[PDB]
Symmetry: C2
Subunit: 254 residues, 2 copies
Amino acid sequence: YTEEKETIKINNIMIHKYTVLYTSNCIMDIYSEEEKITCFSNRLVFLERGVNISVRMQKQILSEKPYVAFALNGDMLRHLKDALMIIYGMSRSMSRKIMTTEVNKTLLDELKNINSHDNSAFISSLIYLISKLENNEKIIESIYISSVSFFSDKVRNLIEKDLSRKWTLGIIADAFNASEITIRKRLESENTNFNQILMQLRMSKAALLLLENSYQISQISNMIGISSASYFIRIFNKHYGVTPKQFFTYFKGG
Amino acid sequence: AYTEEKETIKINNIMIHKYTVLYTSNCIMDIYSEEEKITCFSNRLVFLERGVNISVRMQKQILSEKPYVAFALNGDMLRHLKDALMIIYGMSRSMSRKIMTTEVNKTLLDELKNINSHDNSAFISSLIYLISKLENNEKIIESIYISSVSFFSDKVRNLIEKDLSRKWTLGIIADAFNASEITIRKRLESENTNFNQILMQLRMSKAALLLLENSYQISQISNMIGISSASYFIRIFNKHYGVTPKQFFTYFKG
């Protein structure tokens, strides 16, 4: 159905990598921490690492993917933070975490020429683009804030070692030399818990593997640690608010 | 009859005290140093390593404009630019690695036109952006690195720059460094200069810059740099550069 191919609402997206998104083919409402940030078409979007957002997207042209996104891996992000410090010196609201800006003509050119196979060129383009943006303080702040490795990041790193394993709070506490209460209370001071972390890791991986179109749902369910393919579909639909099929159809066409 | 072509000038004993990116807006320039030659044609960027001594033969196309547009990085700027370049590209003698030219396309020229020498962070971003767009850019980053390290003749120059008018001597330099004259002469010889050359290159560089400001009379400039007589200044300047203060001035301003 054609209205299903333009408009989708997706809940509980966790931004695990610092992300620059260009709304090439969509208008997008971002809902996080009871705020609403509408990004129109042809705007840049900077999503701080660690935000959990819900998104309502409306495509401009139905036959093409909604947006083009750049996710910085942890290395890239470190170097980019380091260079930004040297260039600008050393030194929260949802609006300090998710920011939208207009992209002019030339920026749009360098935006399209991004290599993403060449680290040095890619950091150079980002530095260039950041310098050309006004009020780029909030954006540099955002890159800084997102470069510090919190405790929930150690927990994610532990879990990412073996995403299929049947993790428990006890297992986490063993691996860290603490009691369950210590880890719970340490994760509670960052407003998460262990189940939240584990579910967001599994569901992020599952989303990404779905878009490859190279693994069967039963395969994806096993790769992320869920016993049943029919149970994974229940969980994914409960989590994201759309089914693997509908999710996939939105980003890879019908 | 010696008909002087005012498009053409030959200038000897130029010491590049600051890392310099030069765009040949209105000239072709033959660079002669260390018995080597590098011709830079019109519409080219020229990267001049800090510390090279060159002779230049310049041919203007249009007499009403200055031969070139140059960006000389002060010691601060160069520091940061090298540091950020190390983070973006990683850590790591012939004339061909010291002076390099590349062709200037549309995009490069566009950012070239917007370089703000009042915003340091914008300026380093521009140089970073521009360096990324150059092929064979290894030689250039090598050159920026080499030119960032403070050699001993740089310590001597820092001492002298404090009071360029003082009647400096090798002995005075040797006291200030807690060393013998032979140590300083030989330390300066292992960097291919001597104390008299450093002092002459400092005065004549300053005198060149002051001439181009067009705000000081020759006798003022001579006194500001430490030369007793204005007529003696003209003698020294002409012997050093191979051109008189009047002819030099006319070539770069009006």
